[PDB]
Design a binder for this molecule. Structure first.
Ligand code: ADP
Lengths: 62, 709, 96, 97, 505, 98, 70, 113, 54, 62, 131
């Protein structure tokens, strides 16, 4: 949900030129947060799902 | 500064690694000299001489744990490193000098440099792995991207990309095709699983590279390279010439993929792609709804063929549940004694499948009742028609029949169907071409006649003759189609020869090329066409119930090509000025006289010359491999070999007299077309005198050369 | 119809104020009133209307990171399913 | 599973060996072809670096870079696919498991 | 390596998706009702309509992603459970895994969750179709008509409840509830004036099918006073009872399939209904009816001959395919093709509990995707050219290149091309038919794949090409990036859906 | 005819022109066409073709019965509800509750 | 045919010529070549070729096709 | 039923491999040795294949399931289920491995036949 | 050809033109349809890669 | 169609997007893309929305 | 050259004013197009009136070509002897021998490998040893 909300709130500023100008006139930490956060949450959720869906934790391993 | 420091550090690290490997090799100083017993001087020497080695270890202690942490983050496993505390693990890993044991920085750098060297390519690796897969993938991807990126690259860019991809594909196929034909190479390449077909059945996207596939792909690729070289000439000021070229590239790629089928799903995919490519290519002028009718008719015929093929494949799968074409050919003899209860009838297992395959081929390879779409397909551009008519759409049926050769061997329905249908289709095509004034229509009817002759050859049971006829007919038809397209371009998109004439003076190159192509294609004596006709006539079997009609149709279709070729050549090049005064006079202005004067494009003319030379060389190589005393052909995978090769090796005087009768009919037709005064002329009496003098001189030469001297 | 706010405040609309000029003198006795607003929208100089202007690397980087994570997970799963802590490297590899 | 083929004799095998024939046996794939090869890994790394450089150059020139991005993304994906093909226990025409 | 975590994870994921959907629906209802007295769409910049629409779209997307993850987990759990039942060899030990209920949320209708792969496929397809329909419903909802915005979420919740229950009464009740939302959407959102009689006819046909199904279900329930499929299997029905039950279930499901000659309602609906509703009505309702028929049919053993149902399906397919050449309305032609596909799909499950369900599911998914693509194309054409008949709109590719290319690709996909999942489903279905009836299979392949296909193409090709000289000053513009992305997503689903694991196929 | 209070679809600038009367008549022709006399539906067009089309379901049933008989002759798959799964649904999770 | 004006707003490919076609072609050729090399390696990973000339398949080797043992 | 289909697929794969392994000059006799007999045994009457329903008798299904059970007993007698065909915990897997080691020692410690 | 005007002199040899889509590059409204569609596509791709690729 | 320009890329497009008629309302021009799925009116983060003029007037009158 | 030819006139795609009602009785029977709509099918041989008349005329005209074919066949049959063609005589165990061996094998009439009591005859595509 956080990733979907962030991506929607970061890339739906308007037209292509409007989005380009707005993202350009943004702070470097602000741009990083807009970029990193939406992808980071989805990636972490996918990683957690993949870890749960497997059985790599079995102790009968050599 | 930075460079000097890096050089010094690298030299120091190399020396330290050399010393460590030289001291740790004997397994005596690997821990003693490394881990000296305190002795602060020894500690300083160890951490000052191995410092370049030690620091990297500390660097190795940095990235590893972090990477391990990444693993702990990315796998939720390994329990991180809770056993350590990041101060003992770092110290242990940094102080462990066994990591840089028997490691040479210079060796690693030199090996990495040798990892990009091409001098060690060798030829056996190419033999082990055909690089033609890479070339085909590159060509397909280039075509797809050009369709997707038609804007970033202009007309010149699209042409350059497509030409580069196609030329790479053509160059790749040369040596590999030569090896396949001569060194007897075969291959099956599986591109992973493709699609789940039945419960637990996952068919894989596999391709079979065999002799037939190699030959068809080589012929199609050469024809496509020649067209793409010449297609830019015809569509000079065309609004979508890059689009036309891209469609042609897509069609060529589809034809090549269909020819390289490895499984029954691959063959169906190739047939569907060929049908879609033909439907789109015929729709060159989408703004014109008149050609849309022909496009719809062609699409309907292709869909009917695809439905028949799907039904046959479904029957085969229900019989065997195996989609591998090679395995099916190796297992087609198993279930010959079986029947399927369809409605109230019980037909043999082989009979129904063979009938379906033959019908599907007849729909694709134009036969009686299914050849209508072939003549109406002339609405496509000149290069499009050259590609469609010569091969691919026309060569689909022959290739499909040859691929399933063992299946077609034991079919009674095929046995009776193939000869009569082939002969009738060839005769009809020849007679139609003999009466067509349109260059496109004449060429299409000649192509239909050639397809009928090829089907008759397939009925003969000898594969080599079929392959030779396919190659020669395709090359010659492509050349003739290019010449006719050039003539039509000079005639302002006018294809009918009734409004043409005097173009030889306008286009000398086109006239000469058309003369050569008509001499080769029309089955004229003393050429590849004559050899193919003799081979086809040699292998006929006399057990056919309809033998008289079959023989009559074969003779009639064989004799009709020369008349049409001569008529087209004379009308276009050496007839009266039946063309409009605008076509000639506009280019007859004195101002245009310069060093660059030409009625056609130099690029098109050079492409035609190169294609003709390459085709002649390839046909000579094929005749050398097949028609010579030593059979250099690889295994045809056929267990039914006829004794018809005995006549080709050593026939009797009866076949000699039959061939003499055929050649005498040909000579009589040539004499009739040479001296028939269809119109009154100032030399009509002079023509009669010339003909009489020719007859008398021929009689005298026949008397003197065989008896007198 | 549209009921959104055209005069946005998140950024400044690039406008070219020299394209259109409003008449301000010498108007005829029956002449029409000049246009009050004459600002024209100004697009970026290097923006191509024929091609996508997205020149960022975030999407490609995310795709590469996902592919790398998938490869690492595949390696880990191959190790675990084989009962080995890490992947065992075979001495020779032959085609199937 | 059985051998499925008509059996032969070692004496005949030796007699054929005296004639210069060979028995075709599987050979290891070259390092360029092996997905578990340092050569493959170095090639992937060099391809990734060149793809980044070409992406920068295209950004400077405006040429298409989606193809470079796709190739770079598939650089690990191709290795994954090759390793999956290698690790499978099923056989089609290759050496027996 | 199969631990109890996977089963617990899958059950908790299903329960959490249902509860999250319920909570989002409750929040949206509270916001919509309690932010206005009349609850009408505010024709102002500050309006709850935008917030409600965004909430619905985002909730649908999040639930779709969560459902994809949960369906992967559920497939893994089902494979592990099937193996575990097959794993045990010694007679001393038996599969005994007793799990506890979660604390955060209670069981829906106080019923335990039962999972089937077909249910997950139907849920995913319904989610995608409803997302597409909602995205295409922007130009329909307006002042005083914004109340229908959350209907798609209600349908999704009903489907989730139905596909997770084991009670025949609950299944029948959920199957019957969808009619009211469909009637409400048709009566209030369709723009056509003739759509009133079309909605009435559709409601009447759906109610007739529901009445037949309800009679069959009541007979089944009264015969055995129990509400479990296991208990139903623990009982045997008489010959007449089984025949009547099978006939009634087939009649209801075929009226809801639709089947010949009960396809007038479907034809009129697809002719007159709004584009989003028709996309959702064709995509989802037919699949739900087929799933219900398959679930009921497997639970009941029948010794009767399926010749009647097979012949009905074949005749319906033939009738639907034959009428394609006479259809000049794009929506009508798409409806005829969808009817043919539905009849073909319903033909598959006529062999009882045999190995024919996988082909039916694959064909249902392929038909849903193709019908979604065709409806989206028809909606785009009606938005651009303001028409649905071919006589007034021609030469689309000349003025709309992307639309023409998309139409050509859709035609290629609808041709059952080898790479598409339609090819695999067609192969499976035709193999089964030829195993049962070869000549009938060949005839069915001859008609639909050629005759109906030729008619659909000629109708589509004539509009695809040409020269739109008419209405120069009012020519339409190219497709928006939203429509392009929707078409790309549909094509990607149709293609990549063939690469799914064969454990379920 | 537009529905009451129909919100205009203003896509592409709401630029629509007057339609051709003949085109409109053709568009709204099939939905309004009906027979003039009772029973005239039979002889309309081609009598034999209409008879075959109306009798197609009976012919299809007869063909299916013949095919079923042929399958029974060879013991193939029949048009019967093969309840071989005893009611257990395909991949239906079968777990007990604590 | 003589070239005629086309709508600049229309996304048409009718006789479209790009001045920077060289760089675009180079960029679309190089990464495509790299992808083609990767795909060729992937395809050659699993390949079947006929046995070499002069090499005969001894039937006792597992490379020879096997039979299902009942 | 899936295993019978798999056996038929294995026979087809063997035919396909012999196609590339043996030339057409000697493929006929090689296939006539044993392969064609097993191909005919693994036909539509014996394998579900493309048939939607594998119409077999009750005793026939009993025998097929019995053969499958015998094959399963043979496979699990060596502990081959983990992890392909059996989900076993750490302790159970270790105990089964120890029992398998003991059984293998006992079996290999027998006189030849 | 006889008189073939090069692109320098050709008034009708067009360069790249035409809008990619109907969307306005200078749009000020906070529309999120394209962004939502891209997010859905990326989510599907990531879910395929993360837990289903291998 | 030659003079058509929806986004105003090839020709200047006035901010008013129309020349108001002397007897017709100056209503907003219909956008080419009529997507009504537009998010809430987004103001820049940390925007001062207090009534400055009203506060000044309140200080004056107090 | 020599004349500043204007742009291509819009008359090159004239707009068709439908003067006749496109009755639903001819649905899809005419390919509709905003410029030059056409009939669905083309009959360029309109000199032939009807299909029966066209077939009669074609069969009347084809008699001459049939007679020419008969004359060619007669000229060949009255001037040639039967040839000696057939399958390779030195190989009797190939395409010929395999057929007799399979007809003598009849492996499709054997019992099931697992004792299922179902033979090849128990199939829609059933083996038949006496075709
Ligand atoms: N809608 C229609 N109904 C009947 N006939 C038609 C229709 N459209 C075209 N035709 C036929 O096509 C031919 C072409 O007509 P057209 O050229 O438009 O008329 P005109 O020759 O007066 O210009 C006519 O002879 C007419 O018979």
């Amino acid at each position: 949900s956080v990733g979907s909300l962030s991506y929607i709130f970061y890339n739906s500023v308007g037209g292509k030129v409007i989005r380009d100008r707005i993202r350009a006139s943004m702070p470097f930490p602000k741009r990083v947060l807009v970029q990193v956060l939406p992808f980071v949450a989805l990636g972490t959720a996918l990683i957690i799902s993949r870890r749960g869906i497997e059985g790599h934790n079995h102790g009968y391993k050599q | 500064l930075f460079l000097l420091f890096f050089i010094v550090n690298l030299y120091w690290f190399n020396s330290g690694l050399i010393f460590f490997n030289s001291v740790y090799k004997i397994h005596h100083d690997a821990w003693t000299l490394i881990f000296q017993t305190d002795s602060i001087l020894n500690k300083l020497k160890i951490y000052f001489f191995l410092l370049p080695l030690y620091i990297s270890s500390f660097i190795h202690s940095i990235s590893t744990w972090y990477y391990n942490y990444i693993l702990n983050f990315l796998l939720f496993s390994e329990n991180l490193n809770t056993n350590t505390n990041f101060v003992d693990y770092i110290t242990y890993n940094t102080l462990l000098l066994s990591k840089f044991e028997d490691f040479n920085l210079f060796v690693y750098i030199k090996t990495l440099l040798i990892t990009f060297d091409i001098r060690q390519i060798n030829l056996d690796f190419l033999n082990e792995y055909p690089i033609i897969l890479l070339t085909g993938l590159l060509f397909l991807f280039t075509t797809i991207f050009s369709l997707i990126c038609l804007s970033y690259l202009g007309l010149y860019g699209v042409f350059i990309l497509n030409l580069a991809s196609i030329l790479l594909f053509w160059l790749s196929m040369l040596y590999y095709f030569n090896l396949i034909v001569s060194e007897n190479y075969y291959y099956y390449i599986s591109l992973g699983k493709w699609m789940y077909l039945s419960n637990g059945f996952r068919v894989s996207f596999d391709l079979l590279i065999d002799l037939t596939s190699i030959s068809f792909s080589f012929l199609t690729l050469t024809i496509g390279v020649f067209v793409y070289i010449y297609t830019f000439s015809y569509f000079r000021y065309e609004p979508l010439v890059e689009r036309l070229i891209l469609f042609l590239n897509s069609f060529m790629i589809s034809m090549i993929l269909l020819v390289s089928s490895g499984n029954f799903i691959v063959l169906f995919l190739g047939w569907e792609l060929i049908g879609l490519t033909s439907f789109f290519l015929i729709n060159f002028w989408s703004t014109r709804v008149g050609t849309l009718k022909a496009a719809f008719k062609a699409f309907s015929f292709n869909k009917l063929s695809d439905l028949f093929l799907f039904f046959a494949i479904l029957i085969i799968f229900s019989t065997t549940y195996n989609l591998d074409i090679l395995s099916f050919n190796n297992q087609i003899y198993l279930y010959e004694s079986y029947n399927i209860d369809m409605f109230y009838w019980s037909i043999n297992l082989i009979e129904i499948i063979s009938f379906f395959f033959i019908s599907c081929a007849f729909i694709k390879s134009a036969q009686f009742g299914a050849h209508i779409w072939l003549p109406d397909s002339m609405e496509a551009p000149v290069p499009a028609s050259a590609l469609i008519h010569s091969a691919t759409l026309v060569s689909a049926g022959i290739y499909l029949l040859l691929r399933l050769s063992p299946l077609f061997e034991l079919s009674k329905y095929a046995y009776f169907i193939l000869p009569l249908i082939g002969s009738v289709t060839a005769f009809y095509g020849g007679l139609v071409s003999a009466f067509q004034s349109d260059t496109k229509k004449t060429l299409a009817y000649s192509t239909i006649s050639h397809c009928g002759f090829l089907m008759v050859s397939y009925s003969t049971g000898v594969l080599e003759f079929v392959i030779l006829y396919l190659y020669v007919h395709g090359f010659f038809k492509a050349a003739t189609f290019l010449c006719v397209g050039n003539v039509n371009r000079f005639n302002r998109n006018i294809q009918d020869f009734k409004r043409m004439g005097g173009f030889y003076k306008y286009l000398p190159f086109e006239c000469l090329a058309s003369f050569v192509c008509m001499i080769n294609l029309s089955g004229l004596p003393l050429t590849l066409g004559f050899y193919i006709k003799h081979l086809l006539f040699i292998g006929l079997v006399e057990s056919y119930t309809l033998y008289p009609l079959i023989f009559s149709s074969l003779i009639l279709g064989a004799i009709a090509g020369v008349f049409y070729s001569y008529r087209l050549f004379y009308s276009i090049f050496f007839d009266t000025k039946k063309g409009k005064k605008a076509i000639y006079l506009q280019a007859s202005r004195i101002i245009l006289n310069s060093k660059f004067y030409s009625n056609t494009s130099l690029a098109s003319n050079l492409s035609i010359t190169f294609l003709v030379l390459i085709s002649y060389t390839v046909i000579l190589y094929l005749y050398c491999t097949t028609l010579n005393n030593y059979y250099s052909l690889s295994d045809l995978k056929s267990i039914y070999i006829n004794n018809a090769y005995s006549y080709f090796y050593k026939p009797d005087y009866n076949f000699l007299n039959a061939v003499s009768i055929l050649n005498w009919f040909v000579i009589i037709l040539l004499i009739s077309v040479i001296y028939l005064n269809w119109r009154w002329s100032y030399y009509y009496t002079k023509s009669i005198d010339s003909l009489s003098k020719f007859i008398l001189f021929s009689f005298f030469f026949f008397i003197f050369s065989k008896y007198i001297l | 119809r549209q009921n959104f706010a055209k005069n946005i405040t998140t950024t400044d609309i690039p406008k070219d104020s020299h394209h259109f000029a409003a008449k301000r003198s010498g108007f005829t006795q029956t002449e029409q009133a000049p246009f009050a607003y004459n600002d024209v929208y100004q697009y970026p100089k290097d923006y191509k209307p024929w091609n996508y202007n997205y020149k960022g690397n975030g999407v490609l980087l995310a795709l590469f990171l996902g592919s790398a994570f998938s490869l690492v997970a595949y390696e880990r799963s191959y190790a675990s399913k084989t009962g080995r802590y890490q992947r065992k490297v075979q001495q020779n590899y032959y085609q199937i | 599973m059985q051998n499925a083929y008509p059996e032969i004799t070692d004496q005949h095998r030796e007699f054929l060996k005296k004639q210069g024939l060979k028995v075709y046996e599987p050979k290891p794939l070259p390092d360029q072809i092996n997905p578990f090869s340092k050569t493959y890994w170095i090639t992937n790394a060099f391809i990734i670096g060149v793809s980044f450089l070409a992406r920068r150059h295209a950004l400077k020139v405006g040429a298409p870079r989606i193809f470079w991005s796709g190739c770079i993304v598939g650089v690990p994906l191709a290795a994954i696919i090759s390793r999956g093909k290698s690790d499978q226990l099923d056989e089609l025409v290759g050496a027996r498991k | 390596m199969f631990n109890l975590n996977t089963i617990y994870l899958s059950r908790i994921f299903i329960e959490f998706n249902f509860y999250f959907l319920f909570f989002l629906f409750l929040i949206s209802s509270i916001i919509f009702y309690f932010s206005k007295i009349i609850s009408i769409q505010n024709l102002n910049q500050n309006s709850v309509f935008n917030f409600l629409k965004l909430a619905n779209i985002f909730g649908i997307l999040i639930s779709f992603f969560i459902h994809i993850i949960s369906f992967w987990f559920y497939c893994i759990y089902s494979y592990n459970l099937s193996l575990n039942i097959f794993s045990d060899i010694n007679l001393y030990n038996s599969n005994s895994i007793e799990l506890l209920n979660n604390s955060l949320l209670p069981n829906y209708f106080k019923s335990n969750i039962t999972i089937d792969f077909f249910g997950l496929i139907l849920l995913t397809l319904a989610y995608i179709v409803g997302f597409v329909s909602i995205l295409a419903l922007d130009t329909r909802l307006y002042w005083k008509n914004i109340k229908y915005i959350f209907s798609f979420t209600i349908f999704l919740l009903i489907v989730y409840v139905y596909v997770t229950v084991s009670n025949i009464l609950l299944f029948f009740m959920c199957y019957e509830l969808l009619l009211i939302p469909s009637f409400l959407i048709v009566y209030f959102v369709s723009p056509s004036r003739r759509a009133i009689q079309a909605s009435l006819y559709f409601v009447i046909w759906t109610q007739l099918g529901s009445l037949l199904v309800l009679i069959a279900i009541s007979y089944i329930i009264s015969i055995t006073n129990t509400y479990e499929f296991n208990d139903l299997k623990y009982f045997n029905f008489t010959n007449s009872e089984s025949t009547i039950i099978i006939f009634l279930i087939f009649l209801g499901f075929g009226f809801k399939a639709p089947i010949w000659p009960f396809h007038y309602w479907l034809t009129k609906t697809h002719v007159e209904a709004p584009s989003g509703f028709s996309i959702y009505l064709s995509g989802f309702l037919v699949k739900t009816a087929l799933y219900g028929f398959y679930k009921f049919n497997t639970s009941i053993f029948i010794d009767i001959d399926s010749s009647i149902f097979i012949a009905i399906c074949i005749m319906g397919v033939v009738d639907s395919s034959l009428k394609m050449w006479g259809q000049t309305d794009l929506k009508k032609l798409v409806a005829y093709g969808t009817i043919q596909e539905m009849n073909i799909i319903y033909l598959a499950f006529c062999w009882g509990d045999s190995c024919a369900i996988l082909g039916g599911i694959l064909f249902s998914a392929t038909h849903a995707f193709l019908s979604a693509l065709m409806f989206f194309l028809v909606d785009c054409i009606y938005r651009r050219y303001h028409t649905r008949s071919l006589v007034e709109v021609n030469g689309i590719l000349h003025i709309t290149p992307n639309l023409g290319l998309s139409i050509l690709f859709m035609l290629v996909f609808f041709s059952g091309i080898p790479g598409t999942i339609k090819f695999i489903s067609e192969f499976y279905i035709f193999s089964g038919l030829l195993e049962a009836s070869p000549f009938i299979c060949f005839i069915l392949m001859l008609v639909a794949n050629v005759l109906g296909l030729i008619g659909f193409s000629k109708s589509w090709f004539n509009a695809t090409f040409g020269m739109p000289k008419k209405n120069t000053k009012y020519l339409p513009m190219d497709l928006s990036f939203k429509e392009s992305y929707i078409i790309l997503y549909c094509f990607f689903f149709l293609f990549i859906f063939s690469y799914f694991s064969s454990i379920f196929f | 005819h537009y529905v009451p209070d129909n919100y205009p679809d203003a896509l592409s600038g709401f630029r629509i022109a007057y339609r051709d009367p003949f085109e409109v008549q053709h568009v709204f022709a099939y939905e309004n066409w009906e027979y003039q006399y009772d029973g005239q539906w039979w002889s309309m067009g081609s009598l034999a073709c209409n008879v075959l089309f109306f009798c197609t379901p009976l012919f299809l049933y007869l063909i299916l019965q013949v095919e079923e008989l042929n399958s029974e002759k060879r013991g193939g798959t029949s048009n019967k509800f093969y309840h071989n799964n005893a009611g257990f649904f395909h991949f239906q999770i079968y777990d007990n509750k604590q | 045919f003589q070239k005629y004006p086309i709508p600049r707003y229309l996304h048409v490919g009718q006789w479209i010529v790009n001045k920077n076609w060289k760089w675009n072609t180079f960029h679309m050729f190089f990464p495509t070549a790299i992808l083609c090399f990767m795909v060729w390696r992937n395809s050659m990973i699993s390949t079947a070729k006929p046995p070499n000339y002069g090499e005969y398949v001894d039937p006792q080797s597992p490379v020879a096709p096997k039979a299902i043992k009942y | 039923e899936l295993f019978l289909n798999e056996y038929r697929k294995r026979i087809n794969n063997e035919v396909r491999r012999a196609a590339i392994l043996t030339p057409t000059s000697s493929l006929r006799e090689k296939m006539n040795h044993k392969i064609a007999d097993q191909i005919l045994d693994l036909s539509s009457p014996h394998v579900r294949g493309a048939h939607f329903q594998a119409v077999r008798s009750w005793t026939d299904a009993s025998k097929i399931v019995n053969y499958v059970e015998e094959k399963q007993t043979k496979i699990n007698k060596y502990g081959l289920q983990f992890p392909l065909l059996g989900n076993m915990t750490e302790e159970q897997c270790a105990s089964k491995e120890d029992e398998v080691y003991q059984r293998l020692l006992k079996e290999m410690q027998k006189p030849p036949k | 050809d006889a008189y073939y005007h090069d692109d320098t002199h050709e008034g009708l040899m067009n360069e790249p033109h035409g809008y990619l889509t109907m969307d306005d590059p200078m749009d000020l409204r906070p529309n999120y349809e394209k962004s939502a569609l891209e997010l859905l596509f990326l989510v599907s791709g990531g879910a395929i890669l993360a837990l289903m690729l291998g | 169609l030659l003079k058509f320009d929806p986004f105003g890329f090839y020709s200047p497009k006035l901010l008013s997007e129309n020349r108001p008629e002397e007897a017709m309302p100056f209503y907003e021009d219909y956008p080419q893309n009529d997507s009504h799925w537009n998010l809430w009116e987004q103001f820049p983060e940390d925007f001062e929305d207090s009534n400055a003029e009203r506060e000044a007037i309140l200080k004056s009158n107090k | 050259h020599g004349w500043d030819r204007p742009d291509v006139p819009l008359s090159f795609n004239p707009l068709y004013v439908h003067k006749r009602e496109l009755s639903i009785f001819d649905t899809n029977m005419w390919m509709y197009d905003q410029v030059y709509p056409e009939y669905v099918i083309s009959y360029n041989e309109i000199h032939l009136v009807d299909q029966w008349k066209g077939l009669k005329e074609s069969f009347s005209q084809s008699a001459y070509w049939w007679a020419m074919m008969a004359m060619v066949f007669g000229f060949y049959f009255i001037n040639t002897t039967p040839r000696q063609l057939g399958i390779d005589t030195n190989d009797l165990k190939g395409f010929l021998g395999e057929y007799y061996g399979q007809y003598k094998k009849r492996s499709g009439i054997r019992s099931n490998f697992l004792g299922l009591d179902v033979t090849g005859e128990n199939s829609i595509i059933q083996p038949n040893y006496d075709r």
